[PDB]
Amino acid sequence: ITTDNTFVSGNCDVVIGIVNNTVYDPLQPELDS
Amino acid sequence: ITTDNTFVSGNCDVVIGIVNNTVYDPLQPELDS
Amino acid sequence: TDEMIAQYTSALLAGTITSGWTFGAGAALQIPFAMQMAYRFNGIGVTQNV
Ligand SMILES: *[C@@H]1O[C@H](CO)[C@@H](O[C@@H]2O[C@H](CO)[C@@H](O)[C@H](O)[C@H]2NC(C)=O)[C@H](O)[C@H]1NC(C)=O
Ligand SMILES: *[C@@H]1O[C@H](CO)[C@@H](O[C@@H]2O[C@H](CO)[C@@H](O)[C@H](O)[C@H]2NC(C)=O)[C@H](O)[C@H]1NC(C)=O
């Protein structure tokens, strides 16, 4: 689950049946340097 | 070939007729800062 | 007969709501109806998030 396959929209309220999870940021190792 | 409009899947032997060239990366300039 | 005609229509409806559109193409697949509707919105042109 990277941000390349996702588009954030709204918040965690209107959605029904959502699940908590983590979404990897593909920049963190590249941000470290 | 920007990495923005290109994506990766797997290794470099399963495919057929592949060629050799580095894919251009847009994250190099600003990472140098 | 009207009985098994209505049964055929019931099969059509059940496959449409539950299995998505796949049953007429391959094998029926359980898949949420809400997500099926979101996929249909993606089909028409509006993003499923709406
Ligand atoms: C997703 O995680 C968030 C984390 O903030 C959950 O929100 C709170 O989680 C804590 C866990 O200790 C609960 O005690 C609270 O009641 C939750 N709500 C609020 C308003 O604080 C959220 O519930 C989680 N959702 C799912 C579906 O797992
Ligand atoms: C692209 O380059 C790679 C690496 O040279 C080629 O794969 C083989 O890699 C091994 C180990 O690195 C080398 O010993 C071989 O000589 C490489 N094969 C060849 C034909 O050079 C890969 O074949 C190259 N692909 C193209 C289309 O030139």
Ligand SMILES: *[C@@H]1O[C@H](CO)[C@@H](O)[C@H](O)[C@H]1NC(C)=O
């Ligand atoms: C493609 O065509 C070239 C030229 O005809 C040939 O040498 C080669 O073996 C063919 N196949 C691949 C995978 O390149």
